[PDB]
């Protein structure tokens, strides 16, 4: 005998967590983790409200009607879990926690002696531009900024779910060439 | 008399739509709309599963226990709706459908005679780099690409929820300066 109140409680909590994740501003680094963390809790809630509801359908005998729908739900949950495992594999591979935080498709990366830079990126392009500067010294790509702790390696690489695209450093645009004070531009070209 | 089956049906459908939105790849433009559209449906479902559950609590008289929780849910839904209205105001202001599609914090924009460019961006930076090139002619910022239909204006602006930051075109890095063939780099500096 599974009481129906737990389903309502799970529904209310899941609504709370959807409402929280749908309004969190993605400005600072701490929010992103929060923005991820809430989702994680939500996912558990999304599981808890699902199987319990399924446990009701078998309890009421109304499970033969929508077994396909719940099978689809479980299949998509398995796909999402595999996606999370791939993200964990990427962040282990990129030596940083950025892949779990940011939701970008790709991650341009380069490893130094002490620090490893893993900056999110939309898609593989012919060229990649990195802007080094301060107000704090940092490297910025497409708005995403990472506090620099060392120089830039002439081989930068873009990680992906299934792509590993190396890039070649061609030119470094110093302030004299560009005319913009306190801003260094590094340009990388996609190696064939 | 509100039957309890509708709550289970809404739960199942909401689980389906969470599962769909949590796996959609954000590579092409059509997916983004889909990725948004599903969310829209989900939001309706998130409403439908909520108030109905609330309608059960008043039906069972167990509403006095968690009125605060549902009030918080409704308050957060109001905040999310206001956020969507601000996004619609932005896309009306930016003359493009990109703000409703992309989830970036800011949008760098510039208006031409025939076409209007509204490219997503993370945060306001000192400089902004735009890469013009083909394989198709387009302007690319931080991986996000938009098919170019005209030139670039020397005044580019960044839209935001509450910020309107103008930028000044300082230098144009042509292929001779950079050494990268078929790639033009436009550099904008933030006006004070």
């Amino acid at each position: 005998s599974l009481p129906f109140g737990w389903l309502v409680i799970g529904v209310a909590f899941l609504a709370v967590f959807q409402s929280a994740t749908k309004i969190i501003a993605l400005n600072k680094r701490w929010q992103l983790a929060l923005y991820k963390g809430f989702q994680f809790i939500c996912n558990l809630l999304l599981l808890f409200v699902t199987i319990y509801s399924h446990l009701l359908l078998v309890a009421a005998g109304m499970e033969a009607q929508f077994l396909y729908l719940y099978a689809l739900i479980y299949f998509l949950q398995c796909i999402n879990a595999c996606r999370i495992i791939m993200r964990c594999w990427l962040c282990w591979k990129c030596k940083s926690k950025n892949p779990l935080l940011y939701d970008a498709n790709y991650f341009v990366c380069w490893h130094t002696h002490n620090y490893d830079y893993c900056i999110p990126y939309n898609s593989v392009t012919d060229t990649i531009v990195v802007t080094e500067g301060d107000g704090k010294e940092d490297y910025q790509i497409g708005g995403y900024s990472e506090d620099r702790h060392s120089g830039v390696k002439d081989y930068v690489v873009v990680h992906g779910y299934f792509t590993e695209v190396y890039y070649q450093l061609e030119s470094t645009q110093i302030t004299t060439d560009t005319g913009i004070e306190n801003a260094t531009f590094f340009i990388f070209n996609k190696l064939v | 008399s509100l039957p309890f089956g509708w709550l289970v049906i809404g739960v199942a459908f909401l689980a389906v739509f969470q599962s769909a939105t949590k796996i959609i790849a954000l590579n092409k433009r059509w997916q983004l709309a889909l990725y948004k559209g599903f969310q829209f449906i989900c939001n309706l479902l998130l409403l439908f599963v909520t108030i109905y559950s609330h309608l059960l609590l008043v039906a069972a008289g167990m509403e006095a226990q968690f009125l605060y929780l549902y009030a918080l849910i409704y308050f957060l839904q109001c905040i999310n709706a206001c956020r969507i209205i601000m996004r619609c105001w932005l896309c009306w202001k930016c003359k493009s459908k990109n703000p409703l599609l992309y989830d970036a914090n800011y949008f760098v924009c510039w208006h031409t005679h025939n076409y209007d460019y509204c490219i997503p961006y993370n945060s306001v930076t000192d400089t902004i780099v735009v890469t013009e090139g083909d394989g198709k002619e387009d302007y690319q910022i931080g991986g996000y690409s938009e098919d170019r239909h005209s030139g670039v204006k020397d005044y580019v602006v960044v839209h935001g929820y509450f910020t309107e930051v103008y930028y000044q075109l300082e230098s144009t890095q042509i292929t001779t300066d950079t050494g990268i063939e078929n790639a033009t780099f436009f550099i904008f500096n933030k006006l004070v």
């Binding site: 501003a25 400005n27 600072k28 701490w30 | 105001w89 509450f162």
Partner: peptide, 27 residues
């Protein structure tokens, strides 16, 4: 329509800074 935007501009940032102050010692 811009009056609401001007009023609502910095209140969200102030709330986020309050959250910063509250949960800084928690994480």
């Amino acid at each position: 329509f811009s009056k609401l935007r001007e009023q609502l501009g910095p209140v969200t940032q102030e709330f986020w800074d309050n959250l910063e102050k509250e949960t800084e010692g928690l994480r």
